[PDB]
Amino acid sequence: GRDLIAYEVKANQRNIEDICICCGSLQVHTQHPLFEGGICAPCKDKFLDALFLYDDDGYQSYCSICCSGETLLICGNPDCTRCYCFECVDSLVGPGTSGKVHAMSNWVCYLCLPSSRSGLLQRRRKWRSQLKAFYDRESENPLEMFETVPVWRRQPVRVLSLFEDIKKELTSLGFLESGSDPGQLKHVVDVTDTVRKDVEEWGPFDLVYGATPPLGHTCDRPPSWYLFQFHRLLQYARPKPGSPGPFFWMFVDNLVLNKEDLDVASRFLEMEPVTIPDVHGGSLQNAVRVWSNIPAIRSRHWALVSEEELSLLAQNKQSSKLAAKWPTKLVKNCFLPLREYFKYFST
Ligand SMILES: [Zn+2]
Ligand SMILES: [Zn+2]
Ligand SMILES: [Zn+2]
Structure with missing residues (x-):
């Protein structure tokens, strides 16, 4: 369950890194590349599987945090192709955010601005490199x-x-x-x-x-x-x-x-x-x-x-x-x- 992460951190005071911020599971395979948190084996394999897949219009095909081909919240910055979940935002940020976000005109994804605090959602520092380490390490036949x-x-x-x-x-x-x-x-x-x-x-x-x-x-x-x-x-x-x-x-x-x-x-x-x-x-x-x-x-x-x-x-x-x-x-x-x-x- 996703919605069970809030309590899992605000209440049980549990380190994010120990829970797959993607789906919610507690059996983290390794840590998420782009944001602070962990990722269960199954979600990881989904991540690899959608690493540079793009949509005709020009945007990144799946969600930047979990990979949900649907709930998409586009980034305002023109040089950004990243998109996000409705559930992802609300699940990790704060309830009722996806609405606020979808509400704005010029939104800037979390990976675009510097900030690292955004509810429970934190952008890892120097991630572009960490994302490489990931693929390099987690793929079973890297190229x-x-x-x-x-x-x-x-x-x-x-x-x-x-x-x-x-x-x-x-x-x-x-x-x-x-x-x-x-x-x-x-x-x-x-x-x-x-x-x-x-x-x-x-x-x-x-x-x-x-x-x-x-x-x-x-x-x-x-x-x-x-x-x-x-x-x-x-x-x-x-x-x-x-x-x-x-x-x-x-x-x-x-x-x-x-x-x-x-x-x-x-x-x-x-x-x-x-x-x-x-x-x-x-x-x-x-x-x-x-x-x-x-x-x-x-x-x-x-x-x-x-x-x-x-x-x-x-x-x-x-x-x-x-x-x-x-x-x-x-x-x-x-x-x-x-x-x-x-x-x-x-x-
Ligand atoms: Zn997961
Ligand atoms: Zn998502
Ligand atoms: Zn962006």
Whole structure:
């Protein structure tokens, strides 16, 4: 029970850290990352499971304290994507707060302002780092995981996109400034003769994107070309050892490389392809294979979509006179997590 926490602290005078501030249980597995308190094993596994999951509109999908996909109290600050529970607030803060909060116009989440006292709800100090320690420690197969970046420290993401110009997208998500001549994104198509100096020369990069061309046979160039090349230059673009900063990459196969090549591409990029489809009316409209080190990209995979189902989406995809414009809406959201590491401007 939740509502049983108040007494459990005001009365029994019991240390918060000994009770899962998430659900209420008293069998805490470890301590909550963002706020002072503990978290039962089961709630922890739910937390991990929703670590960088985002909603199309751009906000954090689940509740910042417990992970309740429903009761959502949004943060006023524009650089904040965090949301909170109705029950969470009232349970840990004070009864009747969620109403007060939902009542305001410009609210500022507890993780945004400094304050640490707010009823029983306290924001751990230097949490962005603690949240890393968490995932790193509690996950059962941790992956590359860069600590999150404070808002006043975030800087413009520098992009390098090969074969495809991810600019329109990145710009709409507010990752790329519009009224800017500098242009922190460099598109490049024929890298056939590019060299490490070239890349190093092209300014340093934060995110390296690549993608095989759709089914609109652009070049005689086999598909594997684009893979390998992306591979090659990816290395060139990598941060000079001793680099702390977050460096992300992501290569997209637009359903154009056969199994053989597909497997190779997975040995080189060193990960199995996270296939993300577009289902409309329970039917597979389009799909796209994807490799990346970006947070949560794997938790976007449809184990459901079979190979054969895909080999078929392809067969029918060639047999038609269509532009086959590249599948933007599919990947467009995989970048949302970066919002927590780089600077954002939609204003
Ligand atoms: Zn719990
Ligand atoms: Zn909650
Ligand atoms: Zn906030």
